[PDB]
């Protein structure tokens, strides 16, 4: 019925899971059992053997995409490419039949890799590319298609109170526009807890750029809300260097309502990144205090605000998730499971859990491409000229605006 048994090989460990399904005709012979030989652990070289095996496509369907997406966690791109060239050059002396079929798998694996993660192929792999290119001509072997594509990748002061001037849904569209294109630019392998977790380490300032870009925009929005509601513009690094607009509580309320509606419009656009930027910013400590202003706020705005806090035309069918839940999940996943087993074998089960999460943001990326958002250059230049307050600046202004009693 359902049978599971382990295996062991040169430098790897497998697990076969063959389930016998009942035939469609109850009196017919048993149909061939549906089986899946899945790699569980092994050396880096053994992983490349499994990678270049023609059987893997059907036996371990999701080994290839999982290795490719996660390899930067335990290796580098030129090494992985290098080992694939090692194997192929080793098979040169072999009988031509075994050479062709593997070359074929190698062609198929690299093309998938190229389509899935082009930003992997920099100038770092120039030698490995030559290695593969020499091979294909030497053995006489979409080869030409792959080489063409690989070579083309290896060888190439605004007023924050002016938010009231724009319609709220118009603002959400612009914010969604910016968040969405950053989410499309997101390289999901950079979200891995073994890379994002070490972003602060003494040599990783240029590591994980696409993820950081997402965070910087989340912080610019949360800054914009905080700075707007306080009616203050940051003119220096210091806690005192900032000009404040004098505003009565009823006037501040109008800024609260505006942003609450901006949040709500982001929710209808399914841009949760900015919903969470606006909401957490409204719940932020320098703006949470402002009771007078919060007391002057229309009650329907407060209900929408509650409804949003409890979560935490053709306006495009898309989504921008709050990355952070994902980053949390990946960071905790990196710390919960070990990189390597006691024998020094790479724990490939961890990567499988990792890739499953990386898969979900891949489908969200494809969903995100359904967005129909039109650029607004007036809102865009307003945002670009916006100078947000530091946490120290915002706390000082809040006290000067609504003093403690």
């Amino acid at each position: 019925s359902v049978s599971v048994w382990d295996e062991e090989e040169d430098g790897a460990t497998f697990t076969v899971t063959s389930r016998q399904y009942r035939p469609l005709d109850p009196l017919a012979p048993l149909p061939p059992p549906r089986s899946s030989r899945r790699l569980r652990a092994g050396t880096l070289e053994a992983l490349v053997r499994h990678l270049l095996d023609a059987r893997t496509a059907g036996a371990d369907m999701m080994f290839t995409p999982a290795l490719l997406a996660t390899h930067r966690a335990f290796t580098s791109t030129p090494a992985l490419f290098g080992l694939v060239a090692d194997r192929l050059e080793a098979l040169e002396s072999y009988p031509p039949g075994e050479l062709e079929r593997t070359t074929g798998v190698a062609i198929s694996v690299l093309s998938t890799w190229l389509a899935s993660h082009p930003e992997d192929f920099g100038s770092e792999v120039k030698g490995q590319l030559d290695r593969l290119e020499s091979f294909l001509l030497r053995t006489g072997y979409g080869s030409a298609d792959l080489i063409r594509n690989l070579r083309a990748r290896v060888d190439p002061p605004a007023d924050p109170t002016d938010v009231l001037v724009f319609l709220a849904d118009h603002l959400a569209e612009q914010l969604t526009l910016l968040d969405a294109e950053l989410f499309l630019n997101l390289i999901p392998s950079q979200c891995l807890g073994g890379l994002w977790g070490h972003r602060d380490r003494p040599g990783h300032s240029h590591l994980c750029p696409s993820v950081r870009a997402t965070v910087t925009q989340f912080n610019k929005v949360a800054g914009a809300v905080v700075s707007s509601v306080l009616g203050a513009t940051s003119i220096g690094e210091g806690p005192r260097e900032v000009t404040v607009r004098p505003l009565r509580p009823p006037q501040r309320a109008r800024l609260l309502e505006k942003w609450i509606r901006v949040a709500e419009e982001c929710r209808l656009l399914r841009n949760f990144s900015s919903v969470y930027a606006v909401v957490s910013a409204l719940q932020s400590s320098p703006i949470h205090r402002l009771r007078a202003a919060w007391g002057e706020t229309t009650r329907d705005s407060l209900r929408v605000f509650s409804s949003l806090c409890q979560i935490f035309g053709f306006r495009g069918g898309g989504v921008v998730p709050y990355l952070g839940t994902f980053l949390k999940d990946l960071v905790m996943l990196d710390a919960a499971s070990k990189d390597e087993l006691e024998n020094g074998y790479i724990n490939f089960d961890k990567r499988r859990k990792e890739f499953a999460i990386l898969s979900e943001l891949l489908r969200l990326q494809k969903e995100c491409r359904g967005y129909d958002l039109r650029p607004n250059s007036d809102i865009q230049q307003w945002l670009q000229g916006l100078q947000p307050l530091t946490e120290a600046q915002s706390h000082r202004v809040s006290c000067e605006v609504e003093p403690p009693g």
């Binding site: 380490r201 932020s284 990196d334």
Partner: protein, 146 residues
């Protein structure tokens, strides 16, 4: 009978490493008494400005975690101490400084423990020494406030 704990620090410090070993919400026995605790991690979400602010509002006790290797991660500890005081405007609040070994001197670690009215404890990544002590230490300081 629920004590909300927050673990604060930089990435790569291993708050998440310290979190998982204490448990693997949890029902525990403090002083012969059944208590539940929430450890809410800022894991992966450390660079998000307004997010941690929301955590610190509901959180009743804090763990300030830095690594004993990096100077940079230890330097960021006063920022986290500042952020907590901004959100919770009170000096007398449950707090614990945590060094995590996996370069910065021990005498310089004890200095910041002395500057504030809160104890300092060092912990190891997988040796699991003082891993239970750290939470149990803070929970009592939370219960003290209760």
């Amino acid at each position: 009978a629920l004590h909300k704990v927050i673990m604060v620090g930089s990435g790569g410090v291993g708050k998440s490493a310290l979190t998982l070993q204490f448990m693997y919400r949890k029902k525990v026995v403090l002083d012969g008494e059944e208590v539940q605790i929430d450890i809410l991690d800022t894991a992966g979400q450390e660079d998000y400005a307004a997010i941690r602010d929301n955590y610190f509002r509901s959180g009743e006790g804090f763990l300030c975690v830095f690594s004993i290797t990096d100077d940079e991660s230890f330097q960021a500890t006063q920022e986290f101490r500042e952020q907590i005081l901004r959100v919770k405007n009170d000096e007398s609040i449950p707090f614990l400084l945590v060094g995590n070994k996996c370069k910065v001197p021990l005498s310089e670690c004890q200095l910041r423990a002395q500057q504030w009215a809160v104890p300092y404890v060092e912990t190891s990544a997988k040796t699991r020494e003082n891993v239970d002590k750290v939470f149990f230490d803070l929970m009592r300081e939370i219960r003290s406030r209760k």
